[PDB]
Amino acid sequence: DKMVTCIAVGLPLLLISLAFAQEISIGTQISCFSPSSFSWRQAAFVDSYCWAAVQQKNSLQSESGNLPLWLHKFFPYILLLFAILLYLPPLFWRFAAAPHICSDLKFIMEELDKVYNRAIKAAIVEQYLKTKKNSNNLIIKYISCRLLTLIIILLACIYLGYYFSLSSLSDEFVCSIKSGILRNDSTVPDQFQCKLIAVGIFQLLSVINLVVYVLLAPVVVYTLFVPFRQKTDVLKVYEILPTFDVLHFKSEGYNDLSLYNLFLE
Amino acid sequence: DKMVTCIAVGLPLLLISLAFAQEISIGTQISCFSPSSFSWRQAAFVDSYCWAAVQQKNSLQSESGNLPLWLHKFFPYILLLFAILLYLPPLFWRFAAAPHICSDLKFIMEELDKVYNRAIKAAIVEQYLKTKKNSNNLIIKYISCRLLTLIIILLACIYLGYYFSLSSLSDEFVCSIKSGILRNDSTVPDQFQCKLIAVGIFQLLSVINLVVYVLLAPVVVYTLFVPFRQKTDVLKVYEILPTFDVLHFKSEGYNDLSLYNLFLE
Amino acid sequence: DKMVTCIAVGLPLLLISLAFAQEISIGTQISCFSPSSFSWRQAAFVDSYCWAAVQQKNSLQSESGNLPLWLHKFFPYILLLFAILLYLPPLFWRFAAAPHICSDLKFIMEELDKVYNRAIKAAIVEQYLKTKKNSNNLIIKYISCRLLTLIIILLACIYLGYYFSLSSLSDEFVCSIKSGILRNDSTVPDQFQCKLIAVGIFQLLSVINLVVYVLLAPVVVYTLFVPFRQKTDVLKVYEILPTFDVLHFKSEGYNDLSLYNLFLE
Amino acid sequence: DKMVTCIAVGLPLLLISLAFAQEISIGTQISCFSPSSFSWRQAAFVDSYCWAAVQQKNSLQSESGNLPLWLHKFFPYILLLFAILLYLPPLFWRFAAAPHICSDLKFIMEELDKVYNRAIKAAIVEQYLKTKKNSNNLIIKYISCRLLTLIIILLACIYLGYYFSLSSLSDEFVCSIKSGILRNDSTVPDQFQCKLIAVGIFQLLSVINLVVYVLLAPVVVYTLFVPFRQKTDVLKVYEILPTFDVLHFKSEGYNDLSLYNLFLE
Amino acid sequence: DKMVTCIAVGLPLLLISLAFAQEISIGTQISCFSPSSFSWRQAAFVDSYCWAAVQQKNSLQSESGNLPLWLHKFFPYILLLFAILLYLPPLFWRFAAAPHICSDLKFIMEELDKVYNRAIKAAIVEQYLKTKKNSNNLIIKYISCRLLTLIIILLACIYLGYYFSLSSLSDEFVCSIKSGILRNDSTVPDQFQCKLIAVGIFQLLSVINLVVYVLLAPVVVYTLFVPFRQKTDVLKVYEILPTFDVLHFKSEGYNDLSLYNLFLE
Amino acid sequence: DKMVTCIAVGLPLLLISLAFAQEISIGTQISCFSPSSFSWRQAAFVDSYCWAAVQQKNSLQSESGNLPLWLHKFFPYILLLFAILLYLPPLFWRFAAAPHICSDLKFIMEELDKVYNRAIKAAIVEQYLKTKKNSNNLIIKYISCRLLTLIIILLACIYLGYYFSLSSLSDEFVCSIKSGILRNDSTVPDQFQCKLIAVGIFQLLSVINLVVYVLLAPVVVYTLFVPFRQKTDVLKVYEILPTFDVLHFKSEGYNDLSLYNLFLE
Amino acid sequence: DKMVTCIAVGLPLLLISLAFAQEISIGTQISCFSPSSFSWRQAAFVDSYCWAAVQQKNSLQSESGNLPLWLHKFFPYILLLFAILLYLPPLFWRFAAAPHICSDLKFIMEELDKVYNRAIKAAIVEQYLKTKKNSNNLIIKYISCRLLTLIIILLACIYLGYYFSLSSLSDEFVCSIKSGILRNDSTVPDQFQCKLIAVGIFQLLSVINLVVYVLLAPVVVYTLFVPFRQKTDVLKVYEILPTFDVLHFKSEGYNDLSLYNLFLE
After folding, report:
1. Is D11:D216 a contact under the CB 8 Å cutoff?
2. SS3 labels along C145-186
3. For chain D, how many structural domains are there in total?
4. Which domain holds residue F203?
5. Looking at the domain assignment, is residue G180 inside a domain?
6. In this chain, where does the modification Phosphotyrosine occur (chains A, B, C, D, E, F, G)?
7. What CATH number is given to the structural domain containing F47?
8. Would you call B73 and C200 a contact, using CB atoms and an 8 Å cutoff?
9. Backbone φ and ψ of D174, nearest 5°
10. Distance separating alpha carbons of residues F75 and C76, to the nearest angstrom
11. CB-based contact (8 Å) between F87 and chain E?
């Protein structure tokens, strides 16, 4: 549990703290080039016009190549989704298996105090491996979120891995008010070479979250390999090995593991 | 309870966190095109004038087609309503059935310790199925909110499903101060091609809440199908099957379900 | 209690959350039309002048018809009053009847454990209906707030019902600085067709609170009808029926209502 | 206690919530009429000059009649004083009589369990009226704050009652920089017809707090009339009647008042 | 304790709430008269220049009379000092005498239960006045803060009493940039009749805190007069009378003072 | 402990509250003299340029004398360091001696209840002075922070004592953009007599923290003088006298010090 | 534990408080030199353009020498990383060894109460050194983070040590809009000698965090030297000496270390 909950608590909390670190350094959102003192409010109009008309013109206006790319407006907006989608398998395990694993904890704790009163009588345990001898496909419904956590983290490395080769010239784009000319065909200049403020802190943030998840994907791969090195195959681990390390979850007793020191002599 | 409370807690909390994610990225609300440096305050006057006169002119001024459409001013305002209307059936069940289901929990817990002291005597339960043999239309008054939660989520998919085909050209609209000409008929230009700032984050938010509710409406449909696969029809499930899974609600005991392991041998 | 406290907790909390939803979308408060770049501060002076001189000129300056109507300056200001006036009858019942109803709860709980020890002896209750046989006009002093809650909710539907037919042209009004001409009679233009920013979110908020209270006034009317269908008239319900449903208030016991299951066989 | 603490808790909390309702709708504080684009900062200078020179010129500059009236700068500032001066008699009673009334509560609770063990023996109280037969002028030191709460509420109705007849033309006042002419006698215009922004929400707030206190002053007058209708004069109520209703303060027991039901038969 | 802690808690809390009441109504800090549209930033430069050069020119530039008077820049800054200096003697008594007075409370409570078990035996106390017969100059180290609280409150009435006769014309002062002329001797006007914004709420705050402390200094004088009217001089009160009223500090018992009612008969 | 923790809690809290009192009255940070309406943004550019180029030019540009003095940019920045460096010896004693002094407290409390049960037997203690007869250089590792607190407070009086004689003319300094001339040698004026806003509240804050620490340095000197007047030299105080006053730390008992009253007779 | 947790708690908390001390004194982020009143919004456009185009031009535009150096945009951004990377080894030890060291604490506490009941019998312990005689490479997996904390702190002194010799002239850089000329080749000036606002508080913050870590790196080196001076080599310390000082972790008893005082006589 603890090596799983370490990642499953610290990593979306890391990503939401990093999203807030983005959110402090916002300032404004976009700047456009107003044509040399024609007003103040017309400049903010053109700026908000082009920041609203990024997604809208499906034709070619930036001549960038695959220019319908939605121009990375949404990194707090995407990172919120990715943090809560990594947060949902802990919520699923904590709201659909924690009473059942608490009953399993009560079972193994009455089993260990049964061993304790067997040692008290030394001044039945033999059946409890047979109590967990059945099929029990139900703990494989718990193991599926451990693969489902690898699913979102793998595509995040493909999502942010798209963000590097995007960011050559996907920031300075050319925008217009063509329907503004369509009113009068008289006055306003056509194109304004605007530019987003965001990639100065966004592009060098796709170093960090990418290199964190790539250097942690084998740690989540390693979550499905302790069931291989303790005499049982993945078809046969069904109840023991997803409880055997979970025997170390809450606490122990004065002789839960000191018998090994006692049986040593 | 738990598969119901999972959705009924996480989903309006999702929608209110997404409403706050909208509320951080507001900035301003609308920009209008002031006619080339005639003042500063007259520009904000025209801008607030047209943002106040969206709903008012019932005649044709945008030439958009069904242009009395109220121009999506209200998405935090609508989403607040939809979050609290999804929040109200949990409030109704928690304030009108939780003492009665707590009495049901006390009844089934004294029933299970009656089974426990029957096992203690092995070192009356036979009547308790007959205690719940009556009509009891009262739990069908609890099942109605499970349909009433499907009611609001279904129309939300029709509400946001309206929002896509709306958003072709329901953003750039044309506005005027015609009563301003009616003062003097002298000076001010007539029409100003204003534009809302909102749909750049609103329209690509009607992807998310739509696709979440469509991929969760069969999960709320599935809330009325566990009463079909356990030997009783929906006319006959009245008390057992809305308590049978609710037997797994708070906790269990050392032998509430370990008898199956004991009766196995 | 619970069907009463459901409304009496959730509805003024709804109205104060909706007042805060108004308070987020304020922006500015009013815009006026400054005459074409005569200053910046004179524009804000004229704007604050007319937003301060709404109530003051009792003569006809808007030519609107019943134009001394105070021009809806006060909807957070009125809604705060209406929320706290709906909050005061719960405060009155909780600070003037909750120790007495706690003594009533202690009386009925010693009555039910008297029934319990009567069942223990089966291995005086007959007097307790006569303990509550008197006049007791004092619980009618508790029933008066249930009518007093209907009083404020009924006039709120007449208050907001006034707000629809008001809002035809009670927003664009004409204002002046006539005493400003009285200084010099030289320079300033006379009238400025100002306009409030508020009714774009205020008028379509008098849909919501109106239709909520109209669809909840029969629910508060229904609070005085359970005392009619249980063999006693409103002159004779004095103590039983305002305690009979209040017997279901805190909790019950293992045999407070399981005797009906026991007496069934 | 409870009918006293109802007012003494809810009413200064009402006035401080209403002061904060003023504090949200502030905006700016005063506007002055800058003479037609002479600068921006000189306009704010003149505005802050006249908002600082309201109290200073003791001679006649507004020609309003009793124009040294300090021009209602201070309504959050005065209302804070009036709220804390209504808050101080509850603080005085809670910090100078609550241990002594807790000892009185301990005395009457050991008196009622003395009655309880007298009823247990039925399977000395006769002295306790003589324990409270003395003079005890000390509870009259508690009754003085009930008159001292009427003192501040009465003058508040004279304070706000002054505010109506003030507000005819005590808002638009005329101000100058005469010492500014005394530098050069050259350039600046003399008088500026400024105007406070405050009375649009201040004057129609002296409806509310006035009509609340006038419709609650007989409720505080009624706090000194229950000691008249229970066989003792105000010279003779000294200990019984300011404890007799305070017998209903914390709670009761199973037979603190059920003896009346028992003695009925 | 309680009549001391009433003042010692409520009065610096009053002064810090009044300091925050100042802190809400700040707005800006000073306005200066920019010479008729020479820039915007030069106006704020001159304004911040003169608000920084108030204390600096020790020569005569205001021609006010004793014009090195530092021009009351510091009333939140001074009032913070005066609040914490009135807060420090409660901190000193609570951190240097509260365990010793808790031991004194434990001593007098075992003394009163010794009287209680003497009354139980009626079905040694005679030595305890001799236990407190010594010199004990140590409680005079507690009485010194009661004089030290009078020290700061007395000079505060001389500090704020200086503030009235100051405020005739200590607000409008004349300031320059003479070193600015020393650059070029060409362009900038010399003197600017600036004015502080502060005394409109500062001077009529030296009514309030002055008249509060003057009407409370005899209440702190009265703190050293109860030791005179109970048979002992101030040389002989050393332990009894600073504990005799402190016998009424925490609570009492069922017969701590009801013996007087018992010995009455 | 208590006379030490009084200073060690109240004094860095005083300095951080005074740093926040600085932080409220910031406003802007520096003003520069823009040459008579050449733009707005060039003025803020020059102002931020010179506030960034204070430390950079190591040559003579202010002609002030020892003008590389870094111009007191850092008083919240320095005061934060000095507050946390005075906060660190309490952290060191609380995280490296509080369990050991809690064991010492447990030892002296079992010693005092050993004296208590000796008095109970009157109806071994003689060894406990020999238990603390050894060398114990380890409490001298606790006494070193009491000298290390005097170290930082002494240099603070030399740090702020430098700040007075600095502040003659270390505020108005002359700055330029010489590399700006190096672009064109055409347009911009060379020098701008800027001035910091800070010393109006900074210089008259080096009165307060200086005079507080000078009037408290003998109080920290007095922390190493109680070990001289109780029969042992500083070489011999090792365990008794840094525990003897620490015997008065948590509490006492009914006869921890009342034996002196008992042995008096 | 405590000398380790002192640094491991206080030092990243120091660095994050110092990062927030940076975050309060931000103001703006960069200023550029707009060419003499050509607009307002074009100035902010050029400023945001060059603050976005710092990293982008990989060719020579600053002529600084190794000018692709990314120009220290990221000191809250880097310091957040360094604080959480110093925070992660405490998280690793607290989530992967604290239950095992709690079992070790339970083992040594039952060992000390075994010594206690041996002393009670004086009115088996001999095996417990042999219980910890094995290899136990597992505590060397705890000692690796103590080296891994030295890893990040060592490179931080090389990271900030790079920052001094960088900051000669890595602040004033030259930037252009060359693609802006490529539109028209007509109007805009080419180069703008902009300058970062950050190094006035950033460069003299690389004094502090550098000199803190250099004066604390031997304290973390000293964390691996107590295992050398207590008779065992680093190959043989495996369990005793990383538990021997951890015997002083939670608390002790009345005779856990008072036996040394008892065995002294």
Report:
1. yes
2. HHHHHHHHHHHHHHHHHHHHHHCCCCCEEEEECHHHHHHHCC
3. 1
4. 2-99+135-240
5. yes
6. 128
7. 1.20.1440
8. yes
9. -105, 130
10. 44
11. no
